[PDB]
């Protein structure tokens, strides 16, 4: 059990914990996955749902960064392919091998047909891939147009193909939390930290239950802040400090596969003389692409896509594919996110052109803060967190904290061997936990057999409190299967209403929430009503 039941118990049990963690993203989720495995009594709190922050709004990939070889920044490339190795090892059901395609042009560079080849050999050598079935290779201008029919011809010299990975971020967070649960940790989502319990120090926190206006006080030896782009907002809860962050907005658009077919990931130049590059990626029967870099000020819980972000991106896909003719009217889904950057770094520092871009400082009040960084280095940042924690529990309290190896502790649903039609999907999506799903496959009105269990499983096991957490973060219904959402939408909500036995007004408020969300995704407010 891991639902609203397990939830209420947790809240009560936290009524002096060893460690309190603020933030339920990939960062907070990684700290706990390790602390629990090491003994510490831990109690984490996530203001909204799990992973509903930036950790569900990224490019959704694990790019190697081959681009860095242009300035011979070889140590950065080695770290990256190296850490990417661990993760794939501790979560064999999430990041998957999805070789990428990099076309070469003499009209417009970065590499030529001769240099891409040597760049890809140094890449596989550092990645220790050199030899396996995923070894790089090149393509002739003829054999490139085959795979991608609408790809610009004027000036095509061919292309290169090297290893890269697909990675659902939301699932990475949840299966880390679900493993943190199994190890006894008070994980409470939908609970917001609103104040601090103080002489001059910090001994506790005062949280609010967003499900019930009840205010509780928490007691713990140490309080660590891992609120991502919210790092400063959480800090300022202590009424004198200065800013440490400066986030940027990036967005993505989505279209039907037949409006822009691409059998594999494709990286290329914008063509607007700004040095930026763009992706066009496949994902089920769709193809999404992007992204975007712009200073942002306003609401952090729901950043919005505008006309100018659309203009910019359309001008890019239309130049790289002159035969597509894509307009605002072709987009079926979308999303926006904010990058947790420290004053000084930029968005291009993610792929070229304590951890790289992150820090772990301790405030004078005694608050630990882990900021910046990037999802691909989540496990690595937490190991550096558990260090200033296993030492801080002794030099001040004398607790015998254990020692582990995060690089080898496999998480939820993925404990099998690394080199491991709707039961096929279920296996390759939940991995191991697909076993528990089958046992449950007593359907529901308007739904299907399989779709019933994946919903029941969410409620029983994935802390599904609201319907949106299911169609958005626990599965790919809203973002990649829009054209199938309207014949499962109402049914799903009623099974939720049933399981929770909400009420005729709690049910009304919920549905109201799905309306606002789906609409902002489908940019109805821009289309002057679709």
Per CB under 6 A, residues contacting ligand FAD are: 22-28, 45-48, 52-55, 57-59, 63, 192-193, 226-230, 234, 250, 291, 337-340, 350-351, 373-376
Confirm or reject binding of residue 69 to a copy of itself (CB under 8 A): yes
* Tokens found for residue 58: 């990224």
**Interatomic CA distance for residues 220 and 225, integer angstroms:** 13
Tell me whether residue 355 or residue 510 sits nearer to ligand FAD (CB atom). Answer: 355
Confirm or reject binding of residue 109 to a copy of itself (CB under 8 A): no
Q: How far is the CB of 74 from a copy of itself (least distance, A)?
A: 5
Q: Answer for the pair 94, 414: CB distance below 8 angstroms, yes or no.
A: yes
Tell me whether residue 191 or residue 392 sits nearer to ligand FAD (CB atom). Answer: 191
- Count of CB atoms situated within 10 Å of the CB of 133: 7
Q: How far is the CB of 122 from a copy of itself (least distance, A)?
A: 6
Q: Which does 24 bind (CB under 5 to 8 A by kind): a copy of itself, ligand FAD, none?
A: ligand FAD
Residues of the chain by 3-state class (helix, strand, coil), percent to 5 = 40, 20, 40
**Interatomic CA distance for residues 375 and 173, integer angstroms:** 10
Q: How far is the CB of 83 from a copy of itself (least distance, A)?
A: 16
Choose the stretch contacting a copy of itself; rule: CB under 8 A; options: 107-115, 283-291, 297-305, 347-355: 107-115
- The string of DSSP letters for 145-170 reads HHH-TTS--TTEEEEEEE--EE--HH
Confirm or reject binding of residue 6 to a copy of itself (CB under 8 A): no
- Chain centroid to Cα 379, Å, comes to 14
Tell me whether residue 110 or residue 227 sits nearer to a copy of itself (CB atom). Answer: 110
Q: Which does 337 bind (CB under 5 to 8 A by kind): ligand FAD, a copy of itself, none?
A: ligand FAD
Element (H, E) at 208: strand 204-209
- Count of CB atoms situated within 10 Å of the CB of 394: 11
Interacting residue with a copy of itself among 13, 70, 96, 233 (CB under 8 A): 70
| 457-462 own/partner pairs: CB under 8 Å, 24+ apart | 457/433, 459/3, 459/496, 459/499, 460/1, 460/2, 460/3, 461/1, 461/2, 461/3, 461/178, 461/433, 461/436, 462/2, 462/3, 462/174, 462/178
Confirm or reject binding of residue 131 to a copy of itself (CB under 8 A): no
**Interatomic CA distance for residues 177 and 86, integer angstroms:** 18
Tell me whether residue 78 or residue 211 sits nearer to a copy of itself (CB atom). Answer: 78
Look at residues 44, 23, 12, 50 and name the one whose alpha carbon lies nearest to residue 466: 50
Q: How far is the CB of 126 from a copy of itself (least distance, A)?
A: 8
Q: How far is the CB of 41 from ligand FAD (least distance, A)?
A: 19
- The residue count for binding a copy of itself (CB under 8 A) is 13
User: Contacts with a copy of itself in 34-53 (CB under 8 A)?
Assistant: none
| Site residues for a copy of itself per CB under 8 A | 69-72, 74-75, 112, 114-115, 118-119, 122, 126
């Amino acid at each position: 059990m891991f639902s609203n039941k397990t939830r209420q118990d947790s809240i009560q049990k936290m009524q002096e914990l060893d460690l309190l963690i603020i933030g339920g993203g990939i960062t907070g989720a990684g700290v706990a996955v390790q602390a629990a495995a090491s003994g510490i009594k831990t109690g984490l709190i996530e203001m909204q749902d799990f992973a509903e922050g930036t950790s569900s709004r990224s490019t959704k990939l694990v790019h190697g960064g081959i681009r860095y070889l242009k300035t011979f920044d070889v140590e950065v490339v080695a770290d990256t392919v190296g850490e990417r190795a661990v993760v794939q090892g501790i979560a064999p059901h999430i990041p998957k091998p999805d070789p990428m395609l990099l076309p070469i042009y003499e009209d417009e560079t970065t590499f030529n047909m001769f240099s891409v080849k040597v760049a890809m050999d140094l890449y596989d050598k550092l990645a220790n891939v050199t030899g396996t079935k995923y070894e790089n290779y090149t393509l002739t201008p003829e054999e490139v147009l085959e795979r991608e029919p609408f790809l610009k011809k004027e000036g095509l010299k061919g292309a290169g193909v090297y290893l890269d990975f697909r990675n659902n971020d939301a699932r990475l967070v949840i299966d880390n939390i679900k493993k943190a649960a199994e190890d006894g940790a008070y994980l409470v989502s939908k609970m917001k930290a609103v104040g601090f319990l103080y002489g001059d120090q910090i001994v506790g926190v005062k949280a609010r239950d967003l499900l019930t206006d009840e205010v509780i006080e928490i007691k713990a030896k140490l309080v660590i802040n891992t609120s991502g782009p919210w790092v400063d907002k959480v800090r300022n809860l202590n009424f004198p400090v200065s800013p440490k962050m400066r986030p940027t907005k990036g967005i993505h658009l989505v279209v039907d596969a037949k409006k822009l077919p691409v059998p594999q990931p494709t990286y290329f130049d914008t063509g607007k003389q700004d040095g930026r590059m763009v992706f066009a990626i496949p994902r089920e029967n769709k193809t999404y692409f992007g992204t975007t870099d712009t200073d942002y000020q306003g609401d952090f819980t729901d950043p919005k896509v505008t006309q100018e972000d659309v203009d910019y991106l359309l001008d890019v896909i239309n130049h790289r594919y002159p035969e597509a003719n894509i307009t605002l009217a072709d987009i079926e889904a979308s999303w926006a996110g904010l990058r947790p950057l420290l004053i000084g770094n930029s968005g291009s520092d993610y792929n070229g052109g304590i951890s790289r871009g992150s820090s772990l400082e301790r405030e004078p009040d005694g608050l630990l803060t882990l900021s910046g960084g990037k999802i691909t280095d989540y496990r690595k940042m937490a190991e550096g967190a558990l260090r200033l924690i296993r030492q801080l529990l002794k030099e001040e309290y004398g607790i015998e904290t254990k020692e582990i190896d995060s690089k080898k502790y496999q998480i939820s649903g993925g404990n099998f061997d690394p080199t491991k039609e709707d039961a096929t999907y279920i296996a390759d999506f939940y991995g191991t936990n697909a076993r528990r799903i089958f046992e449950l496959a007593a359907p529901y009105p308007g739904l299907s057999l399989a779709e019933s269990a994946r919903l029941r499983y969410g409620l029983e096991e994935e802390m599904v409190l609201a319907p949106g957490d299911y169609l958005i973060r626990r599965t790919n219904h809203l973002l990649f299967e829009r054209d199938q959402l309207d014949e499962i939408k109402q049914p799903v909500i009623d099974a939720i209403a049933e399981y929770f036995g909400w009420t005729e007004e709690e049910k009304a408020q919920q549905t109201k929430r799905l309306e606002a969300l789906i609409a902002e995704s489908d940019l109805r407010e821009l289309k002057g009503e679709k």
